[PDB]
């Protein structure tokens, strides 16, 4: 059973440099402002809600 199924078991090492996930805020840094433009339109749409 470990003749070939160890492949997924030994593939866990090549992904060690994956610790860089903290950069997830980097799009959130920007795209949230980019969707803030979308968020502004509903706040533009708040012009008429009163």
The b-or-e profile of 7-26 (16+ CB within 10 A means b, else e) is eeeeeeeeeeeeeeeeeeee
Distance CA 13, CA 7 (A): 11
Does 1 bind other proteins (CB under 8 A)? Our answer is: yes
Residue closer to other proteins (CB basis): 16 or 45: 16
Ranges within 7-46 binding other proteins (CB under 8 A)? 8-9, 12-13, 15-16, 18-24, 26-37, 40
Residues that bind other proteins (CB under 8 A): 1-2, 5-6, 8-9, 12-13, 15-16, 18-24, 26-37, 40
């Amino acid at each position: 059973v470990m003749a070939v199924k160890e492949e997924q078991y030994i593939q866990q090492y090549k992904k060690y440099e994956m610790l860089l996930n903290r950069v997830g805020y980097t799009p959130k840094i920007s795209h949230r402002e980019l969707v803030e433009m979308a968020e502004h339109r509903k706040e533009l749409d708040k012009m008429t809600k009163p």
